[PDB]
Amino acid sequence: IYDPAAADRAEEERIERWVEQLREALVGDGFLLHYQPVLNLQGEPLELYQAFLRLERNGEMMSPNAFMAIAEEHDLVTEIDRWVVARAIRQLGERQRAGHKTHLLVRIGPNSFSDPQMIDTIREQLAVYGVPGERLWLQTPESKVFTHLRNAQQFLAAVSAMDCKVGLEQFGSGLDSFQLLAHFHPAFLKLDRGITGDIASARDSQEKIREITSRAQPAGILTMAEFVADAQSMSSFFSAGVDYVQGDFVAPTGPLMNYEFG
Amino acid sequence: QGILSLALKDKPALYSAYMPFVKGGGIFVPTPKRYMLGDEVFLLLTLPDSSERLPVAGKVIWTTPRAAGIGVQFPDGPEGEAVRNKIETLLAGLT
Ligand SMILES: Nc1nc2c(ncn2[C@@H]2O[C@@H]3COP(=O)(O)O[C@H]4[C@@H](O)[C@H](n5cnc6c(=O)[nH]c(N)nc65)O[C@@H]4COP(=O)(O)O[C@H]3[C@H]2O)c(=O)[nH]1
Ligand SMILES: [Ca+2]
Numbered sequence: 430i431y432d433p434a435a436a437d438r439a440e441e442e443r444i445e446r447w448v449e450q451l452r453e454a455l456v457g458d459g460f461l462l463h464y465q466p467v468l469n470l471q472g473e474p475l476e477l478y479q480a481f482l483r484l485e486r487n488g489e490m491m492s493p494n495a496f497m498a499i500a501e502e503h504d505l506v507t508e509i510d511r512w513v514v515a516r517a518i519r520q521l522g523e524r525q526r527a528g529h530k531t532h533l534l535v536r537i538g539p540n541s542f543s544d545p546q547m548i549d550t551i552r553e554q555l556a557v558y559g560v561p562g563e564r565l566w567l568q569t570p571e572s573k574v575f576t577h578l579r580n581a582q583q584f585l586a587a588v589s590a591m592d593c594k595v596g597l598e599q600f601g602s603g604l605d606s607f608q609l610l611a612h613f614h615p616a617f618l619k620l621d622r623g624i625t626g627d628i629a630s631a632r633d634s635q636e637k638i639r640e641i642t643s644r645a646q647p648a649g650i651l652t653m654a655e656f657v658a659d660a661q662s663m664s665s666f667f668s669a670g671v672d673y674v675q676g677d678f679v680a681p682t683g684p685l686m687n688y689e690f691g
Numbered sequence: 692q693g694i695l696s697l698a699l700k701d702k703p704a705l706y707s708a709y710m711p712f713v714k715g716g717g718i719f720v721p722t723p724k725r726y727m728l729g730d731e732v733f734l735l736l737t738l739p740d741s742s743e744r745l746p747v748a749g750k751v752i753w754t755t756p757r758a759a760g761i762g763v764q765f766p767d768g769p770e771g772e773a774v775r776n777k778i779e780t781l782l783a784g785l786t
């Protein structure tokens with residue numbers, strides 16, 4: 430028989446096991462990365478993938494959506510993002526040793542901008558694996574750069590000096606989103622799905638995208654679209670001058686880097 | 692596969708299936724079939740104290756090879772919050 434008062438008391442303890450599991454994953458290979466190909470829409474494509482974090486326990490695979498609320502509550506997000514960046518650079522070393530010129534796009538949050546461990550991890554790991562910094566691309570949401578601007582600017586200078594590319598995701602939903610860029614010059618912009626999802630059907634979105642790409646190109650800023658799921662979206666992005674696309678129309682996320690770039 | 696279905700006979704089965712620490716709530720669903728993390732799935736869920744089938748358009752956040760199956764995160768719309776509210780109220784012991 431279900432005892433509700435007993436379940437209520439067992440919760441606190443269920444959370445503690447999760448936290449310990451997360452702390453234990455910060456050490457080893459319990460975390461892993463899967464990879465989503467990011468394809469150049471306009472010309473010869475770089476071998477570029479985006480990394481996605483998973484947690485694996487005895488053959489079970491978990492999305493960050495299973496554990497990120499716990500991680501946030503226990504202030505583990507900055508450590509987790511350091512783990513991903515270290516692992517990614519290790520992967521770039523592995524690819525390079527096998528003859529591949531692979532690039533990886535990785536997510537970091539705004540508390541990484543003032544994390545001295547993040548900057549150190551990037552420098553030290555790139556040197557351990559002999560990876561050129563240009564191979565590592567780091568993305569953070571536009572909204573979070575706005576709210577952490579001064580640390581974002583300092584991070585951007587430190588990391589750009591190592592040749593890594595720093596860019597924004599969830600970009601462009603806002604009146605003149607290009608106005609942040611007067612204060613933060615990114616290597617790339619990934620457009621918010623709110624703009625790109627209905628691009629085939631909403632001229633409202635079609636105008637916003639051409640507005641963004643006409644401002645990006647003359648500044649040499651790359652633009653990118655994600656969740657690209659159909660051919661009419663590809664067609665609209667192509668005409669609007671978007672540089673990169675990713676999503677199920679191109680390729681799913683998976684454990685292997687076996688995408689033939691075309 | 693099409694329509695996923697899960698009927699939970701009793702509160703113990705619910706307690707065991709429910710993911711209380713996922714944003715918006717989630718639930719474990721048995722299925723032998725192959726899903727990828729982030730797939731959108733449609734699930735009809737039946738809860739212990741009623742015959743009403745509750746529709747859930749959720750996202751895959753967990754894969755296991757006890758059972759083979761998927762963890763499904765509820766969406767943030769009113770339909771997702773509704774099903775979460777009903778589960779959490781049940782497991783609190785309430786009418
Ligand atoms: N971004 C993106 N996703 C696509 C695309 N096509 C299909 N998907 C799938 O759709 C889900 C979208 O989640 P998100 O907004 O990136 O939201 C993500 C993100 O919030 C978080 N997350 C995933 N990977 C990482 C990571 O490496 N670092 C951090 N900090 N968070 C991550 O977990 C959520 C769920 O990730 P998944 O379970 O992997 O599930 C992902 C992904 O597998 C695409 O073009 N772009
Ligand atoms: Ca409780």
Ligand SMILES: [Ca+2]
Nearest residue numbers: 504505507508
């Ligand atoms: Ca911390």
